Fold this sequence. Notes:
The complex is a heterooctamer, with four copies of chain A and four copies of chain E. By secondary structure, chain A is mainly alpha-helical. Helix content of chain A is 72%, strand content 4%. Among the domains of chain A are: 194-282, Helix Hairpins (Orthogonal Bundle), CATH 1.10.287.70; 285-360, Helix Hairpins, CATH 1.10.287.70. Chain A has helices at 2-42, 50-83, 95-109, 139-143, 151-159, 167-176, 182-192, 194-217, 229-240, 253-280, 285-323, 329-360, and strands at residues 118-124, 131-137. Chain A has a two-stranded antiparallel sheet with strand order 1-2. By secondary structure, chain E is mostly helical. Chain E folds into two domains: 5-75, Recoverin, domain 1 (Orthogonal Bundle); 80-143, Orthogonal Bundle (Recoverin, domain 1), CATH 1.10.238.10. Helices cover 58% and strands 4% of the residues of chain E. Chain E has helices spanning 5-18, 28-37, 44-54, 64-75, 80-91, 101-110, 117-127, 140-143; strands spanning 98-100, 134-136. Chain E has a two-stranded antiparallel ribbon. The longest helix of chain E has 14 residues, at 5-18. Chain E is elongated, with a radius of gyration of 20 Å. At the D-G interface, helix 1 and helix 6 of D face helix 1 and helix 4 of G. Residues 55, 57, 59, 61, 63, 66 of chain E line the site of one calcium ion (CA). The PDB classes it as transport protein/inhibitor.
Amino acid sequence: IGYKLGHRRALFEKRKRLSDYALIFGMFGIVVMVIETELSWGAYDKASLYSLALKCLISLSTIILLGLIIVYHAREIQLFMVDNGADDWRIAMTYERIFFICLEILVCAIHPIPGNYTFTWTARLAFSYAPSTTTADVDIILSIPMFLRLYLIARVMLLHSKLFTDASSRSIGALNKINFNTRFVMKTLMTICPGTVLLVFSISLWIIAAWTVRACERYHDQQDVTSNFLGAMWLISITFLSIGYGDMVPNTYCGKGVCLLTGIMGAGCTALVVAVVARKLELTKAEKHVHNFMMDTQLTKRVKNAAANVLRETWLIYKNTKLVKKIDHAKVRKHQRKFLQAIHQLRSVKMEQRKLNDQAN
Amino acid sequence: IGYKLGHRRALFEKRKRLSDYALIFGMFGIVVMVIETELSWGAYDKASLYSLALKCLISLSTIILLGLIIVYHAREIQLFMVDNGADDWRIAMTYERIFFICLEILVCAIHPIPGNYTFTWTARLAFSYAPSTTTADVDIILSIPMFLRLYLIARVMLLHSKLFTDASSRSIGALNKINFNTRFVMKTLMTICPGTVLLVFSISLWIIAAWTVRACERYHDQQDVTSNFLGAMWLISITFLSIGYGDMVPNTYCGKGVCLLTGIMGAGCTALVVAVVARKLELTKAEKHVHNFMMDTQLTKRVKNAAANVLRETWLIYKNTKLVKKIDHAKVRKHQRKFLQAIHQLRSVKMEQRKLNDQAN
Amino acid sequence: IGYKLGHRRALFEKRKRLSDYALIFGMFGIVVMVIETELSWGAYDKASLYSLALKCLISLSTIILLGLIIVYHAREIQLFMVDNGADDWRIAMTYERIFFICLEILVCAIHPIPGNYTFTWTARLAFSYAPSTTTADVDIILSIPMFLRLYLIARVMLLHSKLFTDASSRSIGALNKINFNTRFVMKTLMTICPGTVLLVFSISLWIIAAWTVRACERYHDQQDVTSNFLGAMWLISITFLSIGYGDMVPNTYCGKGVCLLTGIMGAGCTALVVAVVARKLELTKAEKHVHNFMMDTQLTKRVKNAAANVLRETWLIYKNTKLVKKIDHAKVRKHQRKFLQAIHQLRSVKMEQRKLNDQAN
Amino acid sequence: IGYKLGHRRALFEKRKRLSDYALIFGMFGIVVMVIETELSWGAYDKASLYSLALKCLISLSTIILLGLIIVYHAREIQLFMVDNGADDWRIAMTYERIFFICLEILVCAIHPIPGNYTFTWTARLAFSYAPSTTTADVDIILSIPMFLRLYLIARVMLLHSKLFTDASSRSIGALNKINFNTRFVMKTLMTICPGTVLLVFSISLWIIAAWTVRACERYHDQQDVTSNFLGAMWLISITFLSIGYGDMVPNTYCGKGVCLLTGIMGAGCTALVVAVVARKLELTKAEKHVHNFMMDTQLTKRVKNAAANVLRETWLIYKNTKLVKKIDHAKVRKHQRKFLQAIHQLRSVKMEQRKLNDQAN
Amino acid sequence: DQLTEEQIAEFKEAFSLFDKDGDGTITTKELGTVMRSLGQNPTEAELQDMINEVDADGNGTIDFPEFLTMMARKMKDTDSEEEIREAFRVFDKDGNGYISAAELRHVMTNLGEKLTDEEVDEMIREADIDGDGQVNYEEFVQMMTA
Amino acid sequence: DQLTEEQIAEFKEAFSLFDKDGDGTITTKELGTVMRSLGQNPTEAELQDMINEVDADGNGTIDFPEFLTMMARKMKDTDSEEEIREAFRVFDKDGNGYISAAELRHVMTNLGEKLTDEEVDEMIREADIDGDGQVNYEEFVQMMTA
Amino acid sequence: DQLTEEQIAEFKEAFSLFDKDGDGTITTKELGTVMRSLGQNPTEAELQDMINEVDADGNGTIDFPEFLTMMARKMKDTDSEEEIREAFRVFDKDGNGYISAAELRHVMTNLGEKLTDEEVDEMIREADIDGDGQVNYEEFVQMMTA
Amino acid sequence: DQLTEEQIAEFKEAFSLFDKDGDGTITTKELGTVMRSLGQNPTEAELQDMINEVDADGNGTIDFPEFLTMMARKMKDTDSEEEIREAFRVFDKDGNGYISAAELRHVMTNLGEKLTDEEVDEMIREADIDGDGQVNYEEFVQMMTA
Ligand SMILES: [Ca+2]
Ligand SMILES: [Ca+2]
Ligand SMILES: [Ca+2]
Ligand SMILES: [Ca+2]
Ligand SMILES: [Ca+2]
Ligand SMILES: [Ca+2]
Ligand SMILES: [Ca+2]
Ligand SMILES: [Ca+2]
Ligand SMILES: [K+]
Ligand SMILES: [K+]
Ligand SMILES: [K+]
Ligand SMILES: [K+]
């Protein structure tokens, strides 16, 4: 039917459009938070007006993002109603569906609110076991969880997927009853180009984790060890590869948790990358055929050479032992040694030829 | 025969019932021991009455558990007599059978007895090589081995197994001569759901090993490093992954032994988990079939485009070289470069299509 | 003929007998060296008579071992002459047989000679970078290489091999042209029982390496860290598993070399052990068939249950909306939700059954 | 055509000749740089004449190498013109081709120029976090990148390759449409002899990285820890195997970068080496057949022995039960135990034989 | 919502996948060839019931207007018509499409969540309107209509 | 002890695995099919000796009361009657079961733990009841009986 | 430049790879066996056009002087004659080598970078000089020739 | 020592591996069956020359005394008779075992370490005793015997 297919396409585009705005308004807030955190350490203090303005901008972006999420979920419920022949929206409200909306709202609602709030922080230093106490601001607690807003990139990639938005792809998949969920696209990407995915994921995790470690280690490091950015990069790299900590053990449980997560991720990433590299070094069918042809040629030549050498040595022994009148025993002994060596070489090359012929099967 | 099958079934239920009581009376003792150990450090001392009462409870539970084990083994011997057509119980008593009963009794008999006993403990501190001497209680030596009572969970799982207690399962297994032992159930569980088993085993080992390390490190740590519970958790996690020790080296051989066991277990657990994850990321049937169809369509389209480009470049070169009176050499050189590029693209896409067809073969 | 086979068999037994005496006279010297090294540190000094007597015993055993090696090689040359139809022994020297005899003599000739000799030793301490100088005896340099006499165990195992000394085995191998060298037996043992070989090799290497590390660390350790035997065992264990060094870094290049060798060995041993463990956890054919049968039965039952649920949910909706007068919309909405849930469960179980049947073959 | 093939062959030889001179003039400069760096630390200073002479030699060699590279690329462009039926060299100049020539020139142009230049260097010491400042020469910055000249060895190996310079191989590749690039030769070498390639690469990387670490650590190490050559070798070896750093953490970003590169390389090298070792421990076809034959014979013998034992025990039980007048129950019970044991042994050996036959299927 | 030209072009490209000949109709062998590449081997009897399900002219021809109708039902997540088909054929053997009242009462009281005796009695009474005993399970055609 | 009603249901459900037709009778082909799916290919000769081993009515058909008897023997860990049969079949040639005392004396004095010549002399004397020399190994049925 | 004596030896040795029975002639079956070892199974029609491509005597046999000519075209990275020919076979149907002028206008204005209407109109006029309608793509050889 | 009873028992047990019948005779099919289990598939002609190689009675059967002789030649690491013979088969493919003097001079002056013309001239003169030109390589047994 013309209307029925046209109605579905309109809702698909409307749902696709709303996903880009959410990503924009999440990334804007993340970038502003990073800038505020960096500039509130040495440029200005937490009682000035720049912090107030930046946090007001963050709050406004958060409000807009929450509204966009609500509208997106309303449109998705409309699509569900269309796709199942249901004329009441209350049928779509299950316990599983309600929980995820609340989880999304809770994740996207956390941000540093304007104001001036402080608390007391106590830590135990590394390699010296000395106590350390300082007064810190609350906004560091509320800004680290803001990185959870990165789940919107997966949604945007799924809604912009070529397979997800192709009439022929859907038509073929319907015949085979294939669910076009977010897991199918990830598996397809892993089958197509695993190395690119692994590299991008590793670089993004590296940068984000190093910045987070530096941010947590600012407060208790008075010696420029774990608050250095290059030092944090090196520490994350050596924890990812599981070489050790050196003298870069954090004095904070935030750094310890980030290091544990980095090690857990690296444990699997290393194996996956190694498997991909091992697969990349194999030959193809035509290359294997050409290589086998050439190897057979050289093996035939060497077999012929060894066979000739054996007969040469035999004739030399016979000549030196009978035709010559006075027998030089050194010569005949040398020729017998060479005869045995030639026999061994001949049988070795024959064995190699047989092994290659068997392997070619 | 009705009676023979009925008698056999009754013994199965009687043996099944006795296994739950042993698990209950072992876990009760373990929990009471943990509570006593925790509360005897700061709440009260070892000369009060609460310790006496708790240790008396532990001893009573131990006595009941030993009695239950004896009755269980008597019932199992009766079942053996029924299952082999033997009318004398002395036939069932072999050297192998007797040894395991004594081993079980010895394992289940160890517990902290009531009283007040102390000894002298000397240790060498880590990273500083300084001697340390203290007086400690004997009950810490007798309470750590109490974790060996966890072998009853496997017995309870085996006796409650669906395969072990299903008439059709036994009927089918008899025709194929299959031994329904503990190893078979473990292998079946690994084949069905390995990830759940690995996760549960890892979490239980993590918690138990961290508590044990803290308990051994209480006596010689006066700086809150290895006696901290979160620090012990982090140390166990980083030893499991084989990243290093940091500054968390124990001052006691108990901690060293626990770390060695954790590393040995992790060496294999990591590989098993990685293999499972790698297996779970692959496409299934009816998904590769859908993927290959779209790949073939895209390859066909790109081959047609490359051929069109080649023909267009050829025509442009011919037109610019002959039809036009003057010759602009820059144009013809550019068109020849594009012609070569199009040829290379065409052969590349042809090779890719051939490789895809060979893979799909 | 009869005599030719009889003469050949006599040489085999004569060569077999001479290999046991060499192993005995090598192990005796190694044990005496270990005892002398242990007892010359605290019991007596190097100017007493016990050291002289023990070193004289070592020298006598070394002389006897060298004589035995010479006789063994003479017998092997006789066997070579018999086995190739040669009537002169000079046809056996090939610039390679000579080299290995000299290598064996050189390896077996090193031992601590009687006397009193000292030299100056300077080392750089770990974690403090402090110089350390002492005067040490030369016999520690001459006694460590004595562990190279362990290559005789492989020779004894080869000459006592069932395959090497079985008439039927040789008769069958001759038809297939199989070389019964020392590499064949090792590969056969690895195919049959790899775990036993791995365990024995690991335990022997552990003990020997720990003793060697302690022996080289005696001279420069004045704090009982790397000279402790249990500490050396723990250090070797954690270097084998590649967890780290902790605070157990040696101050001597003996320890560094032994740790490097232990890490190199562990890198491969861990992979071999985990591969064996993974291979030992799989099911066999009959139990696989039984498991598949039971799973098929369970899937059949669950599919029937889901199919019943679907029809149950369908009727109710009609009944509570046509047959019934008033319409309770909550009831019909609940029943429609349950209807959708039942449909999803049915398709899920059907997909699982199809996957099982597709993977069975 | 005779002339056409003759002209093509001449260019191949002319291109081969120019590649050896570039390698010679690069290795000469590298060796002279190493000697100058070693001798400018303790023998003479940077204001003498020996440094001037050596750096003048380096500059002259660099000029000659640049000229050789230019001539080589001109000859390669001539080859391209011949091989594509073109008549103007401007058709060969693309963006990709131009970029690589400039990259090569830039890589080969860096070297320590004559003069006397210094700068200020500040570093943070390890395990103590103490600042360190010194004045250093610029030539250390310009001499480390000189190791990038090692890419010429691959070019020389490719141009001297047997496959690349054999008429039959080229003809077969032409019939099979095989691109004889530098990647094909590397894959062929990996298929033929991977262990040799791995060993050579590891040893060269070990030596070069250790020398580089020592050279960068000279300036800030006043305690002979990371400036020692053997210590650098040990540090590189233990970072390659990912065991840890010990107390050998560098105070310079040179060492940190080199250690990161060494760990990245080792992560893959270890897996490749262990895979090769695992592949090299397997039996061949004839060895497998002989082993299976012998195992079948042994299994047959053991089956017959167990079957005989069962009947012997049965007869003994019957004889003691009835034929003897007085019944000694101890003997009867012993014989019944032995009867059950024999039955179990028989069925175990039968199962083993069935498993062997199924495996050999 | 009126299927603009670009949207029709996408369905035009999809239609050409089955319509290899380019004439403008999809035959049984044309449809069967595609399904064979996806890992299925349907019989001609299975194939025949798919064309006539969507075919409206009764000529075994699937043109472009009919191809759109087939897609609409396929893109749907759940089809109440087809899901009820699969439920009965689980218990429907002999390939005849008839279920006796004896087995229908048994399955609905022992399998699944289980109905109650008076409910199945009313259900059977409504189901067995004919009264012959052989309840052809096509009653859901009028059951879901209301 | 008897059998509870629930216990009979478990065995009845197991019986339906072989009784696919629901006729209450297990035929030779019904028993063969389940064994083929388990990885075994017995011949009709091997199948026939299985039914009549448990069959008591002599009709070559296993019903429910006979099915219970078969399960009792199969669920035992060791069956002394069957294990002695397997030992004899190892040394049994030509598929007849009438091995002579020549091989019987040889195997019992050279293979395994071996028996004294006086022991086997009494053993053969008791074994050789027929007296022709072809010792049928069916004597084991009366060996365990007494 | 010419061919030196050692260079001819290299090409002579390569010649013996196809010519198994040394007689100076390469037959159709000799070439086919070599290509079968490389994973290719050409038909006799495909093989036949290979010999006469380089055969100057017209005897259906490749000798040493003709073998050198075949090698020269093979060692080239790109052959303008061959690559243009392969492009036409992409759109070539029925294996006749003729393409209607209707298809040319469609491919050159919708596929690839695409040409304008004036460009293709001139191209059709030059390509289809005969005016019959069927455009044999043999006109490609006269493009590079002049 | 040569006829120790333990050694004869070891070889007697090995003899029973081929002698499946137990009579004491190894037939052609008995030897072929063993070689088939080892991964080899010899023809009747190949196996026939094996029996008569060690057969002294000429009856075509290998008994125990002949079995010992076969083992003695097999246990040797190197047999001068066989290895020299195997080298000739490399250049002898027709199967009749005849090598012309033209190829013999060719191989010995270009392949391997090569011999000078004077030595091969004497070698050919000594080898070509018949003078017909077809140099049968039976001279190798003459070389070793003398
Ligand atoms: Ca059509
Ligand atoms: Ca129609
Ligand atoms: Ca039946
Ligand atoms: Ca019956
Ligand atoms: Ca020919
Ligand atoms: Ca010709
Ligand atoms: Ca015979
Ligand atoms: Ca004979
Ligand atoms: K590690
Ligand atoms: K690792
Ligand atoms: K590590
Ligand atoms: K470490």
